[PDB]
Amino acid sequence: VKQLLNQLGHEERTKMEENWIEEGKRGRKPTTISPIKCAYILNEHLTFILFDDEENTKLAMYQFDEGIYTQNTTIIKRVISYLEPKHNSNKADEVIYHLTNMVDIKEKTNSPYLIPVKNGVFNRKTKQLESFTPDYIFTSKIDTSYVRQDIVPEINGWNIDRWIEEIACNDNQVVKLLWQVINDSMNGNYTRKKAIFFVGDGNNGKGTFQELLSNVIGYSNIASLKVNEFDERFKLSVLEGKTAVIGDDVPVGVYVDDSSNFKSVVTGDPVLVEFKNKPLYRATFKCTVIQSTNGMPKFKDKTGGTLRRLLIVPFNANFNGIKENFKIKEDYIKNQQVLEYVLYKAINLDFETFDIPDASKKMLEVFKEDNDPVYGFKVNMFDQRKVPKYIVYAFYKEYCDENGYNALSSNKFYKQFEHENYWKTDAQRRYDNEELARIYNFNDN
Amino acid sequence: VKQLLNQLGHEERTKMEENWIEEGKRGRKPTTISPIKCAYILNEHLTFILFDDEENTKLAMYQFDEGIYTQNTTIIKRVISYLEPKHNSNKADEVIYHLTNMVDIKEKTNSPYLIPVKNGVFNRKTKQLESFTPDYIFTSKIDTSYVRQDIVPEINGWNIDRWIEEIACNDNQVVKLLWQVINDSMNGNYTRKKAIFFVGDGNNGKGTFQELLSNVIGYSNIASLKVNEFDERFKLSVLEGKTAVIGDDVPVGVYVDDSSNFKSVVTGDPVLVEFKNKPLYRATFKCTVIQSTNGMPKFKDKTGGTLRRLLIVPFNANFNGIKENFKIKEDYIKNQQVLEYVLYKAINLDFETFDIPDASKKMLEVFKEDNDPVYGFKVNMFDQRKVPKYIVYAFYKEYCDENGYNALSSNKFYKQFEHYLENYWKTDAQRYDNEELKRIYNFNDN
Amino acid sequence: VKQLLNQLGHEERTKMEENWIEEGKRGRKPTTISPIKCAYILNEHLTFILFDDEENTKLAMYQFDEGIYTQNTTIIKRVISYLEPKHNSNKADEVIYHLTNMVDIKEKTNSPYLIPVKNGVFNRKTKQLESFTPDYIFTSKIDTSYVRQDIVPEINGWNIDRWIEEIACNDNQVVKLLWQVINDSMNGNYTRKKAIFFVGDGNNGKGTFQELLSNVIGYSNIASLKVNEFDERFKLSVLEGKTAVIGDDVPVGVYVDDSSNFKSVVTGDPVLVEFKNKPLYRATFKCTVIQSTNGMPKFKDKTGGTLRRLLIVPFNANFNGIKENFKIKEDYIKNQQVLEYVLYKAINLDFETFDIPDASKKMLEVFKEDNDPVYGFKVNMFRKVPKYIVYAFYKEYCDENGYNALSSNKFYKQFEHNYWTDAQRRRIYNN
C-alpha cells in the first residue's frame, strides 16, 4: 500500500499546486497535505476502525498483508508518512485523531468457531480455511501456517507422531488427550472449562511439549503464569490478549492460599483485572491453563470445585535414562514442517469436551486422597461397629501417616457429609470408652 | 444528529464565506468555524449539561439514540467533528470548555422509582414504560429491552422457569427469592440492605445464575468484587457506576477480619472511595451485593448486625454428571428472548423486603453457630440449675467438642447476650458442692 | 451577576471598537477583551480575595447568591466567560493570575461564635441571624435554612422529638446529649475536645442518626473516616473544609495502635495534613469526630488522654423486627421541615461542655476496665503490705484472657489506686 499511498499523495499535491496556480501566487506554494484531507484520503483508500467507543480507544488499521487489525501507533505513523512524509509527530497525531473521529465502531470478532491462522481464518463449523478479509476483526493470529497434509513429516528419521506416542508410553487415550489439549490451546474464545496439569518425575518431555505448544501457537499469543501466582496483584494483567497461559514449573507441593482467580479463569467466569497504575476493571478470560510441574500442588479449598476443574496428564516416560536428544527440543520442534503438520492435525480433530483417560481418573483420585486427608482416610478405612464415633475417628490413622492437620469433631461432620451405611446410633457399641483416642488396632472382631 | 450537524455545517461556513466576500479579501478566506461559535451552535441544537459545580467536572452530552447522558470525551469530540471536522484535538477541547462555561447545572436523577432500560424508562409507581427524554438524567441503563411478554420463550425445548425451579430444587420460596433477587439487582438506587449469598458444593448453577444476571443487566453495569477484597485499597472505586456487584467465587472459610466497607455498601451508608492517583471523596453506593461461594465465609464481626445484613440462598441442585448441559450457561440464557422475558418478570413484581425462605433461616442459624462459638455451644447446650457457672465454662464444653478460639472467662457476658431461653440468669451460692471439671457430664442430673 | 458582566463586556467591546475606528484600520479589528482589562473589570465590580500569601494559593471569589467565598476554578472561569466568552482555558488562567496579583489578602473568618447557615450567618453570642456579606469570609455553609420554629413538624404522624426520645430509650440525659452532639457537629470552629462514639449492637438507629446529621449539615460538609483510618497516608486530606467527620462502622474491637492523629483531630491540636502529590502543610482541624460501631474498640495507649477525649452514647433500642420503619431513614429524615426544625432546636441550644449521662459514665468505666487490664483488676479486687500475693499475675489476669507483666509495671496499679511494711509476710482460689 506504500506505492498506492505515495501515488495518491503525489496527485493530491499536484492538485493543490494547480489550485494555487489558478488562485495566484498567494499561498506561497502549498506543498503539505492538510491533516484533515490526509485523513479523508486514508479513510477512502484504507480500512481504519475503532474497536470500542470508550474513552481513549486507540485507532486500529487493517494490515492487508497480515490480515489482522493493529493498534500499533508506529505502523499507522509509517502509513501517514507513506501518504504525507512531511508531517511531523504532532501532525500525524492530528491525522490519527481525525481518522478516529471519522471511522465507524466495530467490535472484535469473538466467535469461537473462527480461529485466526497465518494463512487465514479457519472456520470450525465448516472446518475450512477462509482468506483474510477486513470483515473479520482480529488482533492476533496463530504463528504457524495451515496447509493440507498427507504424510507425517520426518527430519533425520524423527517422526513427530512417534514422539507423541513415546511421550504417553504408548497409550492411545493419553495421545488423544494431548492432541485435544493442543486443539483447545489453539482456541482463544472457547475454554472447555478444564485445567490441564502435566506431572513429571524427571526428564519426561514436559518442557519439550511446552515449547512445541509455544511454537505452533504464536509466541506472543502465550502467557507465562503459575497457579500460585494467580492471586498475586498485577499478575492477571498478562492474560489480556493471550490465547493460552502456561505455567512452566509450579513448585513441588506448593500451597495455594486462594485459587478464586485461578478457578474463575479456568471456568471462564469474569474476573477483576488491574494494570500497573491503571483503573481496575473486569474481563472474561477464555484462555486455557496448562501447568507443567513435578509432583502436584496442594489447594486450600478442599472442595469439589477444584476437583471438577482439574485434569492431570501422567507423562510417565523418562527420557533421562535414554540418551538425551537436545536436537528434538532445539531443532526438531522448531522445524516449520513439523509445526505445520501439528497445526493441521490438531485443528482438524473435533471433540465436544475432554475425554478423561483411565490414568487421569486414577491420578485424580490420588490427588483427592493426598490433598484431602479425610478422603484418603475414608478410602483406606477398611473398617467393619458403625455407631462408635471415636472408633470411627481413631485419630484418623496417624493423620493418614501424612501429618496433614485434621480437626476434632468438625472434620467428622465433613467425613459423614462426604460419605450407603450413613450413620448408626447404638448404646451398646458406643459410650464404652474401650479406647481413649498411639493407636495400633486395625480391625476389631 | 450527524445529519443535522452536517447540515448546520456548510451553512455557517457559507455565512462566514459570504461575510468575508462582503468585507473583502482580507481574512484569507476563512473556512473554520470559531470554537466559541461551534459551542454556541452545539448548545442551541443539542442538549449538554453539567452534573455538578465541582472543580474540573466533565461535560455530559445527551445521546438521543441511547437516551442516557454520557461524559465520554470521545463521543463529544466525534459530535464536534460532525459539526466542524477541521478542528484539532486542542480546538475540540476549547469547544468543550466553552460548552462547560455555557451549559446549565442539573443533578443526576436518582429516584428509586425510575429504572433506565434499553427500551425506555420504567416507572415503578405507575408500573409503566416511558420514552426517553432529556429531562431524565441517567448515565447508564439496563442492556435488555423491555417488551410486553405473555408466553415464556423456549429455546431448544428449554424453559427458563423450569430451569429456575430446577436450580431451587422445586421450592416455591426459593424461586420467589430468586426472582426477587433478580428484581433487586437491577435497581441502582434501592438496596433493601440484604447481602445475597449463593452456597453450593459444585455445579449448582451459581455461576450460571450470576452470568444470567450479568446478561439481563448490562455487562458494564456489573462490578466484579469479592467480600474479602472490599477493604483493599482502590477496590471500592469499581462500584462508582455499577447497579450490582457480583462475587464469582469467595474462597471457602476465608477470614474477613474487617467488614466495615462491605457492611456500608450492603446498607445505604456513605463510604470513603478513592481512585488511583485521584483525591479521596465520599459516596453512597446502593448497588446490591451478590456473592457465590462454596460455604459461608468466616466473619470476624460476631455482632448481630453483621448477621442480619447477610442473606443465604441454597443451591442444592447437582449437575456434576451427564445431566450437565453446556448450552444452558453458554447459549440459552444469552438468547435475547429469554433475557427480555426475565427482565419483564423481574421488573413487574413488587415487594418491600426480601421474603426469607425457611431453608435460608435454617442456614442463617447454622452460619450463626459456625461464626460464633458461644452461640453454637448454647444451641448444643441442653444443660438444664445453672448455678455452677464454672462447669458452664468448661472451655464451653471443649468448644462444644469442635475447634475454635475462646476467651478466658470474658465470654460470660456473651452467653447472656446470645440468649436467655427460659431460666434467664440463674446463679445460686449453693455450686461449690460439685466436683470441679472430661466428657462425662452431658446430662441434666449433674 | 451574569447580566451585569454581560453588559460590561458588551460596553467594553464597543469602546474598543470605537478606539480602533478612531485610530484607523490597523490590523485585524480587536474583538476580545485583553486578560488584563478583563481582570481589572472583574476586580472593580466583583469581589475577589486571597486567603493567604503562601505559594500558589488559589484565588477566592465571593458568590453573592451563595454568600460564601469559593476557590473552585470552574465557577471563576464561568464568571470570566460571562464577562468574556471568547477566552479559552489559558486566557481564563491568565485572568485568574492577574486577579491573584491584584487582589488583597484576608484571612478566613474563624470566629467560633459565627456559624454559616444557608439563610445567612448565625451569631451565637447574639443568638441572631445576620444576612450574608462579603465581610465575613466563609468557604462552606450548612445546607439547611434557619427559620423560626414554633410547632414540631410531623410527617405521616411521625415526630422527630418523639423519635429522638425513642432512640434514647426514654432517657432525658441521653436526648440532651444527642441535641448537644448535633449542636457541636454543626459548629466547625469549636471542638469541645471530645470524641463522640455511638456504641450499640444490632438494629439501633445509629446510622439513621448519622444520616440525619449528614442531612441537616451539608452532605459535602461531612467527612468519612473511621478511627483506625486516621494514621495512614492521605487520609487527613479528607478532613479539610469539613465541619464534622463521621465513621459509619468501626470494626468491632479494632486495634488502634496509633492514635496521635486521632487525638490531634479530636482536640484543637495542629497536625500535618498531606494531599495526594500536592504540597503538604500544617493545619488545625476543629471538626468533631462521631463514630458508630457495635462495641467499644480498645486503644493501644490505654492512658488518661484517650479516656478523657472519649465520649460514649447509648443506643439500646432495637428495631430488628416488625417495629422497623424504613421510611424513617429513607424519607422522614430527608424532610425539609424536619431538618429545619432540628437545626433551629440545635443551634438555639447553648452550653459549654457535654452533659455526660449516667449510662455513658458506666460504659466509660467499663471500657476503661476492658482496655486497661490494671483498672479491671482494681475494680474486681474491691491486703496492703503483701505485694506478691495481690499481684499473683493480676490474680490470673482477672479472668479476661489478658497478658500480664513481670511484676514491675504492675505497681502502676497504685497509680490507679496497697499503702506502705511487713518483714515476715513479704490457680489459687483465694481478695
Ligand SMILES: Nc1ncnc2c1ncn2[C@@H]1O[C@H](COP(=O)(O)OP(=O)(O)NP(=O)(O)O)[C@@H](O)[C@H]1O
Ligand atoms: N524423545 C525425546 N523427546 C524429547 N526429549 C528427549 C527425548 N529423548 C531424550 N530427550 C531429552 O530429555 C530432556 C527433556 O527436557 P525437558 O522436556 O525440558 O525436561 P523436563 O524435566 O520435562 N522440563 P520441565 O517441564 O521444565 O521440568 C532433554 O534433555 C531432551 O534432550
Ligand SMILES: Nc1ncnc2c1ncn2[C@@H]1O[C@H](COP(=O)(O)OP(=O)(O)NP(=O)(O)O)[C@@H](O)[C@H]1O
Ligand atoms: N438445570 C441444569 N441442567 C443441566 N445443566 C445445568 C443446569 N443448570 C446449570 N447447568 C450447567 O452446569 C454447569 C456448571 O454451572 P456453574 O454455575 O458454572 O457451576 P458452579 O455452581 O459455579 N460450580 P462450582 O464453582 O465448582 O461450585 C454449566 O455448564 C451449566 O450450563
Ligand SMILES: Nc1ncnc2c1ncn2[C@@H]1O[C@H](COP(=O)(O)OP(=O)(O)NP(=O)(O)O)[C@@H](O)[C@H]1O
Ligand atoms: N425509631 C425507629 N423505629 C423504627 N424503625 C427505625 C427507627 N429508627 C430507625 N429505624 C429503622 O431501622 C433501620 C436502622 O438502620 P441503620 O440505622 O442503618 O443501622 P443500625 O440500626 O444503626 N445498625 P445495623 O442494624 O447493624 O445496620 C432503618 O430501617 C431505619 O429506618
Ligand SMILES: [Mg+2]
Ligand atoms: Mg462457580
Ligand SMILES: [Mg+2]
Ligand atoms: Mg449502621
